[PDB]
Amino acid sequence: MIIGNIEHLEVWLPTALRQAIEHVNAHVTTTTAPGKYDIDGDRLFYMISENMTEPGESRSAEYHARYLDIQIVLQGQEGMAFSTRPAGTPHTDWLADKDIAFLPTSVDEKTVVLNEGDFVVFYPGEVHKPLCAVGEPARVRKAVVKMLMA
Amino acid sequence: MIIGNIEHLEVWLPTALRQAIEHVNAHVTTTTAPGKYDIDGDRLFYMISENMTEPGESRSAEYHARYLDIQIVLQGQEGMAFSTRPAGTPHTDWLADKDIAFLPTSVDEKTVVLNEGDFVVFYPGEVHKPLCAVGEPARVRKAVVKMLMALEHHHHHH
Ligand SMILES: [Zn+2]
Ligand SMILES: [Zn+2]
């Protein structure tokens, strides 16, 4: 996984990901409604969302098979949980239809706290659990970039 | 910065990083003594160390201008502190001669807990503070790979 901040994109970020984040930076405002927004067909697009965080123990983790995720905090504070090891057995496998599988929290799960402008990149297979509460549940507004891997 | 685990080197990890970790995996035992071990002279080498963790507060972060770091936990549990933002003002700038600048903790400092086999990658300019205590101070055995980067990846002041 990769961690960075959207106001400070460096050459070490793969160029296609840098360009996607710059697209989000150039087009998203605080008034952009929740929904799906275009960049490059099914190869690159992004979703705006706003949700309450919740205790990490109350959500399943997820992974994808075809799409990379860029998770960008626009407003708020988000606990991002993840594993550095391959996914365990999912309780839900919708990879063919929806490119997502859900599975229970791993023994090795880590958490990083993300503030405004921070982003994380998860490549296919990387287990992640967004929107974990940091203290009391609270609203987080985010962009999630999806990029189709070759 | 990149986070992964040395037992699961995936297609998304840059090839040169994968090959360096593969070398560490094939040449470091649990007995390998602390010291400096060259893979390709000063273009690519690693340090084996056994240090005690310390609380991160009031200790200095650092960054480099030319070397990328791969920090690998071989044994133990390490708090890895870091910043997602460019470096602020250092108290000491030894970048040109020693490839390191030291600076006080940033307001935005984050920490991730690393266990056996976990690794993090810091490109030049990425601010980091290794060896932070997780609970009580404890010993951590590590490999730190130093890899000379091409011009495009060098640190920039602005
Ligand atoms: Zn996802
Ligand atoms: Zn370093």
TrEMBL record, chain B:
Signal peptide location: none
Q: Which UniProt keywords apply?
A: Acetylation
Q: What does UniProt give as GO cellular component?
A: cytosol
Q: Which SUPFAM superfamilies match?
A: Clavaminate synthase-like (SSF51197)
Protein's GO biological process: single-species biofilm formation
Assigned protein family: Belongs to the TabA/YiaL family.
**Family annotation (NCBIfam families):** YhcH/YjgK/YiaL family protein (TIGR00022)
Q: What is this protein called?
A: DUF386 domain-containing protein
Gene transcribed to yield this protein = yjgK_2
